[PDB]
């Protein structure tokens, strides 16, 4: 059981999930956390705290390096002795149905990781390349 | 100008907006079109059209591999004779947000995509690697 937890700027987290709704449905535990205008990084930080306290397992999709989002998550992330926290930024579709798609194969989200990290790039074509 | 177009799944493009508009505010020649539950395929490619009749240079930026929005935008890209269209799957907020600080460097789309492609890809990190 491996909780997905997006968190972004703005509301592209609602928006990817909504992607994520039409094309396979409701899932369980996938979250967004919506890092929109006026909250603070301490918001972020609250939030994100809140959705861990009862998983061991957690994969967390940020939209971009260095950003709030990623910054946040990756400080809490070796803060649990316990709990395994993987961060990853550049969140795409592919990263995103990759992760719910395939976590069920994986006990830990170290072992899931590699997998939607190479789908997150393989999902990036130009079409003029056939 | 090169005019960019976000095509996607549910309201992912109204999602991913609002992350550039709280990051760099509101830019010009930068559309989204919601590939929403209800729409067909003809749908998004009446909306495509729409948005390129008076454009020359062209940046679709889409979400996934294979989905209707890439499917929908590749068969387009390649329908008029003078109109230069690229089409990218693969998403992130890094292809858009290079997208939206690069091309002002560039008079056509083609000489902007490889950089678009690259960030798209440098911007997926493992934080457990740094």
């Known amino acids: 059981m491996i909780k997905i937890i997006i968190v972004a700027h703005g509301n592209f987290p609602d928006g990817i999930l ?6 396979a449905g409701h899932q369980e535990y996938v979250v967004g956390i919506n890092f929109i205008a006026g909250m603070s990084s301490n918001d972020v930080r609250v939030a994100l705290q809140r959705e861990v306290i009862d998983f061991k397992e957690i994969l967390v999709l940020t939209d971009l390096l260095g950003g709030t989002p990623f910054n946040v998550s990756s400080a809490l992330s070796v ?13 795409n579709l592919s990263m995103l149905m990759e992760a719910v ?4 194969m ?3 989200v170290d072992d899931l ?5 190479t789908s997150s790039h ?3 074509v ?5």
Chains 1, 2 share one sequence.
């Open 79 to 91: 803060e649990y002795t316990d709990k395994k926290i993987k961060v990853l930024s550049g969140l």
């Open 126 to 130: 130009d079409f003029s390349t056939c």
């Open 18 to 23: 909504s992607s994520l709704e039409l094309i």
């Open 101 to 104: 798609l395939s976590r069920t």
């Open 122 to 124: 393989e999902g990036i």
């Open 113 to 117: 990781v590699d997998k939607v990290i």
């Open 106 to 108: 994986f006990e830990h």
